Design a binder for this molecule. Structure first.
Ligand SMILES: CCCCCCCCCCCCCCCCCC(=O)OC[C@H](COP(=O)([O-])OCC(O)COP(=O)([O-])OC[C@@H](COC(=O)CCCCCCCCCCCCCCCCC)OC(=O)CCCCCCCCCCCCCCCCC)OC(=O)CCCCCCCCCCCCCCCCC
Ligand code: BCL
Ligand code: BCL
Ligand code: BCL
Ligand SMILES: CC[C@H]1c2cc3[nH]c4c(c3C)C(=O)[C@H](C(=O)OC)c4c3nc(cc4[nH]c(cc(n2)[C@@H]1C)c(C(C)=O)c4C)[C@@H](C)[C@@H]3CCC(=O)OC/C=C(\C)CCC[C@@H](C)CCC[C@H](C)CCCC(C)C
Ligand SMILES: CC[C@H]1c2cc3[nH]c4c(c3C)C(=O)[C@H](C(=O)OC)c4c3nc(cc4[nH]c(cc(n2)[C@@H]1C)c(C(C)=O)c4C)[C@@H](C)[C@@H]3CCC(=O)OC/C=C(\C)CCC[C@H](C)CCC[C@H](C)CCCC(C)C
Ligand SMILES: COC1=C(OC)C(=O)C(C/C=C(\C)CC/C=C(\C)CC/C=C(\C)CC/C=C(\C)CC/C=C(\C)CC/C=C(\C)CC/C=C(\C)CC/C=C(\C)CC/C=C(\C)CCC=C(C)C)=C(C)C1=O
Ligand SMILES: COC1=C(OC)C(=O)C(C/C=C(\C)CC/C=C(\C)CC/C=C(\C)CC/C=C(\C)CC/C=C(\C)CC/C=C(\C)CC/C=C(\C)CC/C=C(\C)CC/C=C(\C)CCC=C(C)C)=C(C)C1=O
Ligand SMILES: COC(C)(C)C(=O)C/C=C(\C)CC/C=C(\C)CC/C=C(\C)CCCC/C(C)=C/CC[C@H](C)CC/C=C(\C)CCC=C(C)C
Ligand SMILES: CCCCCCCCCCCC[N+](C)(C)[O-]
Ligand SMILES: CCCCCCCCCCCC[N+](C)(C)[O-]
Ligand SMILES: [Fe+3]
Lengths: 302, 240, 281
């Protein structure tokens, strides 16, 4: 058989690449890390360096604080027993304050306060990391696609644990930190709103999720199919169409009747994935604020 | 109600978005043509997008798309029917002529430069500090064609420096000249390198590069093109 | 009719079946023998679907629904109005799909590219076959399959799910979802990365792939690279769908109880099974 190019058949290494410099504060970048030959069989073998900076540290510190604040709670639940801790790891749960406290920041710690702390930590963690995606791009003079794409994701998360709990009048409507518990909450959230399968945003959202898989399958297999003509070198192909771009476009034109360009295909991409949580966010936001039951809504349309 | 509002709104958003998406992918190979090259009559509902201009690094100019399209090379094909929609048969050697699955595009005759302005791809001999870090080092292994005959020997690996990747094997032929072989079209074995697309007798036809320490976008295309085309056109020489 | 660079690619050959017979195009579309096959299967299937619609007495697409045979019929044939029609329609779909894949193969050859696309598609086809063929057989009636209707199919999903409790607890379902989510994440990034390089800040020069690699090491300390992310995508996708099949093929066959309950295995490991406190003690 023919070679498929899913895994490299020969690895080549050179001096650790410290990357482009542009307006980046080189003082903040780390030192190069080791090289995984493991990783090397799939993609790049070089680890690091990474850029630290102020926002990275804040993000990274709040990030751990969040995770740990949950962790101690799990331990307190486990009776500080490492055996129970392992047995019951997916059953533990840090739940929001009771509906009694409403949008109150005065819930006792064992009764919801600890959840607020953890969330506060996550909030700062996530937003700082957002600002990080933006700045990292600015400092290289790049488009801010990544930060805007990221914002979509942030939308759904914002809505789940912040905007919806606030518009409903209580934190109790938010998602608990826990493996099995956040699954249950999800399953239950649908039951209460009259089956999310009638939420047309939910349905839209699924279409874009399914689609993301469909597309990234299409794009990936295509680029591999024409990497025998240097397909993966998409920037230069955009700047100077190679046969790669041509065979790519034509295979698709001949199959289904229309086609992308190399820059084009990546717009299809960023929008198909970004629409998942965009539509998603909206479906959930209206759920319980404007629409109490999607089946009833489904019967009338109003 | 609000919900009804939102969803109706979205289906409208989505429609102009597809429209956008679609017109952006119309930046190349449009407008459409008839088999004779004259502009086709029905170009679909979508207008050509307004042109956009790319500023290429290292003072290599600009690119504006959509723009005037031209093959900028002869096509050795002849019609096989009297109506539209049928194949065009090569009028010579499709391989030698570069039509079919052997087609190449008239890319610029300059090499791809890395972020610093140095040639992206290099023979490893001239790439200070590069080495095969894993897998079988091909260098020195004979090269076998689909006809199971030896055609040459690997005498180097042309690496991609910024992505630290093996892109082509350089091969030494019986007359002492060398050719590049795309990495993606050869199977490196324990005692040989096997090339399924080309039979031993076609390796010489592989287009040559003008300078021994560089490849240009044009030469990459002519090579990849040629080797790929072997799959369909060397077929009579391939046995297994 | 042709893209400005299409003609030199439109050469004879690459057909799997039937030589030059169907080796031709119709507008942008490539026909090929399988071009014909899929058309025929697609024609037939849509017909039968309309025919089901008159027996149902509705032309409204939100209502139309073609159901499999009821469990009483097992894996035997059933009367048209009573499940036959779905069975043929299913045969026809399969015919369509497989044929569409083989045409992709034929186009692949004419263009001289790899077969990765036909390849990946076969995973979609295999997921569909899991739900209407492999699972029902193994379970023992066509009746376990999902019906062909816009909402009725969402209903099968919901009912089939809730049969084993909260389906969230199906462990291969957990894995399959992690890919779906991960893949979307990665498609989000990849797209965004290339665009931001090709469309930098106003008046600046096209960034480079070195810029792509740097932007990510700066961000998370690693970059899988331009060849990598494409290998990654193909993989996450194929995996999502692979695990999706798996979670269903096991459901109802080797596990018919509540999925949540299957986790009792973990919690009941003798080394901590009786230790008091926590959630389960
Ligand atoms: C409620 C929802 C609120 C929830 C918040 C979540 C928001 C998340 C949005 C994420 C968007 C991802 C987009 C990716 C992208 O292109 O980013 C780069 C893009 C350019 O980045 P750059 O670095 O500035 O420029 C680099 C190059 O110069 C320029 O580079 P370039 O060429 O790549 O960029 C050009 C780009 C410019 O992209 C944009 O301008 C982005 C537009 C954002 C739209 C936001 C969607 C909102 C959804 C509404 C749904 C309605 C429900 C209610 O072109 C487009 O993509 C055009 C989009 C076409 C939209 C079609 C609209 C149709 C309107 C209806 C017409 C009638 C139809 C006929 C029937 O970023 C933006 O323009 C930022 C948008 C931020 C707005 C956020 C909303 C604030 C609230
Ligand atoms: C695989 C998982 C489950 C399942 C769970 C769900 C859930 C959950 C949802 C859907 C949704 C949808 N499902 Mg389903 N669905 C299954 C199997 C199928 C089959 C199949 C033959 O196997 C198909 C064709 C569909 C098709 C569809 C669409 C009607 C809709 C949007 C999907 C999408 O965007 O995908 C991505 C693909 C693309 C963007 C490519 C283009 C796809 C177009 C839209 C295909 C439409 C075909 C349809 C109109 C019938 C044509 C058949 C005849 C030729 C006329 N499902 C199985 C049983 N399906 C969502 C919905 O909103 O519908 C109620 C939804 O919420
Ligand atoms: C019983 C369950 C209910 C149901 C209830 C819900 C609920 C409730 C919700 C969904 C949601 C979704 N559902 Mg539903 N859903 C059902 C059945 C289905 C079926 C099916 C039957 O086949 C499918 C395919 C889906 C599919 C989906 C997705 C399309 C959608 C979420 C998209 C997403 O990627 O968010 C994943 C992405 C995020 C959550 C974004 C978060 C990003 C943040 C910033 C990440 C930060 C990381 C953190 C800080 C930790 C750092 C990481 C560590 C360092 C490692 N549902 C049934 C009807 N579904 C969501 C939705 O949008 O609905 C409209 C939602 O809220
Ligand atoms: C109440 C519902 C239950 C539940 C019950 C089920 C059940 C039951 C099933 C799933 C399945 C799935 N679930 Mg679940 N699931 C729930 C909640 C979720 C949520 C969630 C957030 O809560 C998520 C993210 C998911 C996600 C998923 C996926 C892993 C998977 C669906 C995709 C798939 O299988 O592709 C597979 C892809 C295909 C079948 C598509 C095939 C397309 C074919 C080959 C071609 C189409 C051609 C078409 C006809 C073209 C038309 C012509 C026009 C020209 C376009 N589930 C809850 C707990 N879940 C399904 C699954 O795993 O299936 C195996 C499934 O059966
Ligand atoms: C558009 C929709 C999709 C999307 C897009 C998206 N997400 C994004 C982005 C984009 C475009 C980014 O740019 C941003 C990113 O930087 O990615 C590289 C991000 C991102 N999406 C993430 C996760 C994520 N996205 C998700 C979803 C999605 N993201 C959507 C499907 C999901 C889910 C639930 O499906 C998750 C879990 C992060 C990887 C990253 C945002 C990172 C962040 O905000 O960090 C804040 C805080 C920290 C620094 C916390 C660190 C704490 C950890 C140390 C604790 C855990 C330790 C653990 C035991 C370690 C071991 C792991 C082992 C595997 C080795
Ligand atoms: C494996 C990963 C994902 C994937 C990949 C994938 N899909 C693919 C490909 C690939 C690589 C293609 O090459 C091929 C394509 O050409 O894309 C443009 C395809 C494709 N995936 C499609 C759809 C699709 N893929 C899906 C899923 C996925 N595809 C995965 C998530 C889904 C869903 C539900 O998630 C859908 C709806 C098509 C757009 C296209 C294949 C087109 C095709 O087969 O044409 C032949 C058939 C016809 C013209 C119609 C036949 C009519 C039937 C005879 C009767 C109708 C019966 C049907 C069962 C009724 C169902 C009714 C519903 C309401 C339930
Ligand atoms: C970098 O490179 C790349 C490209 O380009 C350079 C590409 O284009 C693409 C392809 C991707 C796109 C153009 C983006 C948009 C695509 C999607 C969102 C995927 C979803 C697709 C669809 C909804 C279209 C589905 C359509 C189909 C299957 C065909 C429609 C067909 C008909 C109406 C007729 C079907 C054919 C028949 C019956 C047989 C042939 C005809 C005869 C008469 C016989 C990719 C992936 C890519 O990676
Ligand atoms: C230029 O740089 C780069 C990019 O570009 C812009 C990128 O995009 C990215 C971004 C990409 C990523 C973060 C992707 C990383 C990927 C992952 C972490 C993997 C995703 C998948 C998972 C988390 C799922 C894990 C699942 C596993 C291991 C399951 C393995 C298999 C089994 C257990 C067997 C299954 C059998 C079962 C269950 C039997 C059941 C039996 C009975 C019921 C009985 C990066 C980093 C980058 O660097
Ligand atoms: C090994 O043991 C130690 C102690 C060392 C450990 O560290 C182990 C730690 C683990 C056991 C930790 C385990 C952690 C998990 C199981 C976490 C799981 C988390 C999820 C499943 C989360 C799902 C969903 C979360 C959502 C949607 C959160 C949303 C958050 C927000 C939008 C934030 C909103 C902000 C709030 C309410 C406060 C705002 C206040 C202001 C003043 C602005
Ligand atoms: C990126 C463009 C592709 C978008 C796909 C649009 C078709 C999805 C159809 C979903 C059917 C939905 N709905 C609203 C009735 O639930
Ligand atoms: C949900 C995905 C739907 C894809 C949107 C359909 C776009 C069709 C574009 C046809 C272009 C016609 N043309 C110019 C190539 O002849
Ligand atoms: Fe790409």
């Amino acid at each position: 058989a023919e070679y498929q190019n899913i895994f490299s058949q020969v690895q080549v290494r050179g001096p650790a690449d410290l990357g482009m410099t542009e307006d980046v504060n080189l003082a903040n970048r780390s030192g190069v890390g080791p090289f995984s030959t493991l990783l090397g069989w799939f993609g790049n073998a070089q680890l690091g360096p990474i850029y630290l900076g102020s926002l990275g540290v804040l993000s990274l510190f709040s990030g751990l604080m969040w995770f740990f604040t949950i962790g101690i709670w799990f331990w307190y639940q486990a009776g500080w027993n490492p055996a129970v801790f392992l047995r019951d790891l997916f059953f533990f749960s840090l739940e929001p304050p009771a509906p009694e406290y409403g949008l109150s920041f005065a819930a006792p710690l064992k009764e919801g306060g600890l959840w607020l702390i953890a969330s506060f930590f996550m909030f700062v963690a996530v937003w700082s990391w957002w600002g990080r995606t933006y700045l990292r791009a600015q400092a290289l003079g790049m488009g801010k696609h990544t930060a805007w794409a990221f914002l979509s994701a942030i939308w759904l998360w914002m809505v789940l644990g912040f905007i919806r709990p606030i518009l409903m009048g209580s934190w109790s409507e938010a998602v608990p930190y826990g493996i099995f518990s956040h699954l249950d909450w999800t399953n239950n959230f649908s039951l209460v709103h009259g089956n999310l399968f009638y939420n047309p945003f939910h349905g839209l959202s699924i279409a874009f999720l399914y689609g993301s898989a469909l597309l990234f399958a299409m794009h990936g297999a295509t680029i591999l199919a024409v990497s025998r003509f240097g397909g993966e070198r998409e920037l230069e192909q955009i700047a100077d169409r190679g046969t790669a771009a041509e065979r790519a476009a034509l295979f698709w034109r001949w199959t289904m009747g229309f086609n992308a360009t190399m820059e084009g295909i990546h717009r299809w991409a960023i929008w198909m994935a970004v629409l998942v949580t965009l539509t998603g966010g909206i479906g959930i936001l209206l759920s319980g604020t404007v629409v109490d039951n999607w089946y009833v809504w489904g019967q009338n349309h109003g | 109600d609000l919900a009804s509002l939102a969803i109706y709104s979205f289906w409208i958003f989505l429609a102009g978005l597809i429209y956008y998406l679609q017109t952006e992918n119309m930046r190349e190979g449009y407008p459409l043509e008839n088999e004779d090259g004259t502009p086709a009559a029905n170009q679909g509902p979508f207008p050509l997008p307004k042109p956009k201009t790319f500023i290429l690094p290292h003072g290599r100019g600009t690119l504006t798309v959509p723009g005037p399209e031209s093959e900028d090379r002869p096509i050795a094909l002849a019609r096989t029917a009297v109506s539209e929609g049928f194949p065009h048969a090569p009028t010579g050697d499709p391989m030698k002529d570069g039509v079919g699955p052997a087609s190449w595009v008239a890319r610029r005759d300059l090499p791809e430069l890395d972020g610093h302005g140095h040639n992206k791809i290099k023979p490893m001999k001239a790439a200070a500090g590069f080495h095969v870090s894993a897998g079988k080092n091909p260098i020195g292994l004979p090269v076998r064609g689909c006809d199971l005959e030896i055609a040459g020997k690997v005498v180097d690996i042309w690496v991609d420096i910024p992505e630290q990747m093996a892109r082509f094997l350089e091969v030494e032929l019986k007359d002492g000249s060398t050719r590049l072989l795309p990495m993606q079209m050869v199977k490196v074995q324990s005692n040989r390198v096997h090339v399924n697309a080309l039979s031993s007798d076609l390796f010489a036809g592989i287009p040559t590069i003008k300078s021994p320490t560089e490849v240009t976008l044009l030469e990459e295309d002519k090579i990849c093109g040629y080797v790929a085309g072997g799959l369909m056109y060397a077929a009579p020489k391939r046995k297994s | 009719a042709l893209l400005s660079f299409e003609r030199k690619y439109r050469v004879p050959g690459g057909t799997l079946v039937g030589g030059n017979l169907f080796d031709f195009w119709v507008g942008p579309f490539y026909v090929g023998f399988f071009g014909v096959a899929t058309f025929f299967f697609a024609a037939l299937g849509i017909i039968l679907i309309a025919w089901s619609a008159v027996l149902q007495g509705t032309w409204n697409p939100q209502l139309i629904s073609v159901y499999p045979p009821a469990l009483e019929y097992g894996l035997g044939g059933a009367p048209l109005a009573k499940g036959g029609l779905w069975q043929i329609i299913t045969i026809c779909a399969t015919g369509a799909f497989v044929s569409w894949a083989l045409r992709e193969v034929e186009i692949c050859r004419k263009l001289g590219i790899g077969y990765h696309i036909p390849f990946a598609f076969a995973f979609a086809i295999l997921a569909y076959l899991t739900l209407v063929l492999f699972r029902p057989v193994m379970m023992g009636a066509w009746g376990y399959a999902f019906p062909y209707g816009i909402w009725t199919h969402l209903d099968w999903v919901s009912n089939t799910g809730y049969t084993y409790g909260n389906f969230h607890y199906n462990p291969a379902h957990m894995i399959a979802i992690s890919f779906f989510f991960t893949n979307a994440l990665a498609l989000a990034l990849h797209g965004a990365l290339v665009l931001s390089a090709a469309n930098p800040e106003k008046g600046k020069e096209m960034r480079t792939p070195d810029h792509q690699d740097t932007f990510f090491r700066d961000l998370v300390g690693y970059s899988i690279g331009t060849l990598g992310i494409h290998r990654l995508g193909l993989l996450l996708s194929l995996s999502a769908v692979f695990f999706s099949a798996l979670c269903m093929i096991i459901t109802g066959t080797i596990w018919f109880d509540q999925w949540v309950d299957w986790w009792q295995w973990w919690v009941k490991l003798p080394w901590w099974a009786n230790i008091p406190g926590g959630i389960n003690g």
